Subunit: 242 residues, 6 copies
Amino acid sequence: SNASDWSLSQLFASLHEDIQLRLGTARKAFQHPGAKGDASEGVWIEMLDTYLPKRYQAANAFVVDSLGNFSDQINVVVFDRQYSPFIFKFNEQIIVPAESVYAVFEAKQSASADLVAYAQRKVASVRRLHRTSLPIPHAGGTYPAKPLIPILGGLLTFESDWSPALGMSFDKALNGDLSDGRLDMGCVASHGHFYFNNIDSKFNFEHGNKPATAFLFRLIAQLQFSGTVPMIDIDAYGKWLA
Amino acid sequence: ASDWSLSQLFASLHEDIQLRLGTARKAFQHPGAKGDASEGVWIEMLDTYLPKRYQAANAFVVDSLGNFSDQINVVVFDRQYSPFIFKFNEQIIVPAESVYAVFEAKQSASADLVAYAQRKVASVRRLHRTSLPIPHAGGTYPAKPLIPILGGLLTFESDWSPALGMSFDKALNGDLSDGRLDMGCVASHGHFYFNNIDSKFNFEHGNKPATAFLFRLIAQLQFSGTVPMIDIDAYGKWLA
Amino acid sequence: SNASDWSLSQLFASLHEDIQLRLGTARKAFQHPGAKGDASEGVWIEMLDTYLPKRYQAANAFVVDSLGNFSDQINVVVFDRQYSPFIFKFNEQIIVPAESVYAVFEAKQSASADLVAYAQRKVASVRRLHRTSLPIPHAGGTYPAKPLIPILGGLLTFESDWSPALGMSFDKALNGDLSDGRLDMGCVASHGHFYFNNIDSKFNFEHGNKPATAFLFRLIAQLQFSGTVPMIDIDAYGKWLA
Amino acid sequence: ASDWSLSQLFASLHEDIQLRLGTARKAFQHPGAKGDASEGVWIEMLDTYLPKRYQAANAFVVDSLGNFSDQINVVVFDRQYSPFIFKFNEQIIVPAESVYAVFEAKQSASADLVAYAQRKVASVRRLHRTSLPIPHAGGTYPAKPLIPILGGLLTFESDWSPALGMSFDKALNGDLSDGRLDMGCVASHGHFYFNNIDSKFNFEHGNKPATAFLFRLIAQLQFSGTVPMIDIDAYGKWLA
Amino acid sequence: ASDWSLSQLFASLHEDIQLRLGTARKAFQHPGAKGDASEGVWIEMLDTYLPKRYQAANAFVVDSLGNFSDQINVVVFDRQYSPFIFKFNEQIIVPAESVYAVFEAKQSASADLVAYAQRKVASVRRLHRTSLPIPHAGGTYPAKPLIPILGGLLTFESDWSPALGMSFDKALNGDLSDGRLDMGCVASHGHFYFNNIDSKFNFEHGNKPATAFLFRLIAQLQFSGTVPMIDIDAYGKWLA
Amino acid sequence: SNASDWSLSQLFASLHEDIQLRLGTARKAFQHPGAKGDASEGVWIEMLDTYLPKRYQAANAFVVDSLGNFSDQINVVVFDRQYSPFIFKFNEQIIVPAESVYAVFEAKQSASADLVAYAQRKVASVRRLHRTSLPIPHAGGTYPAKPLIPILGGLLTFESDWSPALGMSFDKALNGDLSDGRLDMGCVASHGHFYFNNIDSKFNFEHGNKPATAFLFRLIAQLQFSGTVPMIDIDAYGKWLA
Ligand SMILES: [Cl-]
Ligand SMILES: [Cl-]
Ligand SMILES: [Cl-]
């Protein structure tokens, strides 16, 4: 028909449906574990690359600090490049400084106790890294060194192994690490999303209502509180030239 | 999903097309934006999967006698051996000699839209194509006899119920001369093709419609070989 | 000859001449109204994409707000992406949030009373949209919510239907809408450019002297006063997930 | 460096490869990242220098009977006349008919790795390839007889000392049937190839190993011509 | 502008070239920048409009005997069947066997510049080209006889008055052996070509000079077919 | 072997080694002076493009000011585009306004007295240009016009003609221009890097220890002090439209 009545809700439905279908395809079509994970990770990266404000980069990377310590391989890193160098780039492979990182996510097919714990360990391998912070020159003078921003951590999946998908067993797993490995938010594309409520100090689950889009908006809103990364002391890295 | 499956690959290829065409239709509540969205999905499928000897894009077609076609939603054409006649940023005008196939892409099949597609196909087939003797590694071939230009219709849905039944067949039999459609796809239901042996249209229901259409197009295009060799000096008569 | 004497004026002449010739070509070469408009719009977009500071994006888009209302299709939107998400992106087609918008232009072949009124209606369809604004975290603390920036509106053409091209009839048309649809500036590539003088509350016309380049500089200088877009409340959009 | 020198150009082509492969091995202290880095260096060399009739990428290969290969580090394949079977962002599945050559890329040659490469090559050679009569400007060629698929091994180093000596030769003679390697490169030491006339493997030491391998590959590929013409309707049997 | 017009399309193609070449000359008051600007306009025209079997770029040319050409402003060459000899970011060295045509691009025609272009063309024509028997779908062709390399001169203006008259003709007749120019374009005035039948140069005034040159180039290139098949092992003699 | 022990020092070695090898290749492979310089310049540009924070652009360009004066051709300009237009762009060739410039470098094959003096003259041709600066609108109000930032100047080479490479003769050459043409830093890829110590008012040479990486870090750290470019008065350029 020729009817035209724009709908904002429909836009958010279509955004989510695209993610859910492509994650489902990645899982069904690729029977090789490496290709299946690469395909699924790429769906989440594309969503963040498309929709996050351009102050954020989203990519697979290793994180390193000025003490020479390295993270594990991080499936989805959200990081700064406006004010931050790469530490190393070789074709498409990148190593980013800890000071550039805003958020880190583990992307896997289905939520489980083992996967939640794995993600907690990945997040901890980043949060343990040392971050420098220098006084910041700007048009109005020099700000004090910015206090270190929280690094957001999370878990991105297509499905849940639990029944109900987002139930007490998922909550138990999330409460397994409330310190260096704490997961601030995550998405189960087929079911809902979760986030840590700092005021109540508990995890909240939200069912349905366009899970990937709801996760994306939660991430944008929480990232706003972080502002920009602190200003890196590249000369701390330079101690390793000799 | 225990093991690799060709059937699953072809299902996923098709499901991506069907879902994105449905998104284009639902999300863009503006006629121009909706058509642009849907056309781009079909063009992307062809760009991704057709052999690289084929280009696929929106274009006008023109011949060396100054006859211009209507704007064509989906033109499949050669660029390995053919120039553009004109390009201005994204807008292109191709010579008739470069064309392999022409498709109209719309939301839902109907008698009016089948007729519209038939007229668009005829408008390109009625253009004059030159053909020169072809130099090659072994010498010079005689001028290639002109290749048929394939035509068709690509939609998401059908206005008819049943979707791919007698009313659709009647519409397709409305032009059996130079607007005859060779093949088409209704992403939500199936695909169709002209059966030259039986001189009738055939419908195939389900069974991964976009992928089935894609394969039919590749197989039929192979019979055309490469485009005939253009006489660019015929176009050059318009320089004076 | 081998003489070399750099000229800044010549650079600005060549910038303008390129625009004027390509707009003329778009009009003469494409006898299909859709292709002709697409070709001309693309010339103006390319100029802004090439020369505007990179804090600005320039593209064709629809604008939407957190109340679910949509603008008309806008030929040339100047908007932020450094701090603003897309609301929806499908291949190259984009829907931007009202909070991201700096300026909106209608691009057509020739100025007339009807086209000026059409442009006024397009601009109004954007300015009527609701824009959120949150307190802004930054390295020095938190700014108050930024007061909403003006959205600049205008009209970009190749020719003028009036004789003289930029005369009292054009002025009359511009004075038709001094509120939601007011056109702050515009360019008639073959003749000159116009702008609203806020202090005198009248429209000023400038004839010749490299019209497209003069328009570009006027736009850059006026955009500087807007600073960056206010900070979007993405959770206002999130009310439409349920 | 008084004047232009072909030898210097070929030395610089090789030195770039050797240094970047060494960087990949040293810098990336993670097995997945290290392999990705090294594979990308070899793919970039082929992408840069092979004739554009050849594509080079990581891919799975599948045939029209549903047989799938293992993941292949470096596939050299046609896209001018061949579709993808499936593409999802960077991941691709190509039809067996499109394949010209397959290589395994690893850090250092060893008996286990030579055997691994032989098995990978056999896995692709054992796939079924269709071949149809080929329309062209002069008519229709008979179906092209199937082209050999070239196979090999690409490494930075050798675990053996001497690097390219009798132990390497013994490993290469471990598969003289459908896993036989045609050529390979050890960037730090030399290259090897199967000599069909003498029915033995030959090693060439130094003398710009990556460039020498590149040239051997180009020359050998020329004998294959273009891939046979795929029967996409054989794959279409999996639509139902 | 009531209706579509081929003449208008060809006028707009030419006017874009003429205006951009004039901008390059006026705006860039530095000899290196001015030449880079103008050369890029001509390369862009060829990149946009020539059939994709042709590449167009600035390059050096080298042969398998180690003879190097001067730097060539505009080389038209094959990459479908030909490797690069060397590539380092934007700088390329192509094998003589890949070359279809060579042009010098400058601001204004003059006796010195016509002679300069003749010498540049001769420098490429004097390089040795290999040619091997060519495998193809039907078998193996004999080695292709060597194709002529087309040469010419591309400028914005002419220093002579009249621009394209007897003095220009005299300069063109200064080299009728291996520096002979086949065609060229003076964007502000017309184009020229060697008439093999009459063994004389012909000038065409106005009538969309860049477009006329483009069409002449396409038509003449078609007679060359594809480049002969390179013997990369001839270059490989320089590995040792 | 299967050992995995990440090393930050190795990353910095590999970054430098890539630069040193590619500069050596440019010098050896291209026997045409224009191609050789284009090849070498491109190596340095790629390093800065890859690793500098994205607030910086790096390219070959001419610089112009609002008085109509032009610099010489600058091999490597580091400049802003987030807040600054191009003055002219024609295919890949660019002319940037003086207000956009952060740093300028001359890139050549081997350091010598003549090359140091040439670089000093190039840097002076940029520093002599006039830069405007306007009060800066931002989310917190309007900053005063930013005082003009120093433009960093330098010299980038593969080799040194002197023996020792970085000795008293190099120091003498650097002390030849301590004003408009002063070179703040530079790199001799095969030997080390140098920088001007403002506190001691002397040049310091650092030998080995990954020269290109050490230069890159020195540049990043010094650029941080400059903050962002002052805000351009595009209407000063607009005086040349008439
Ligand atoms: Cl018709
Ligand atoms: Cl097997
Ligand atoms: Cl010569």
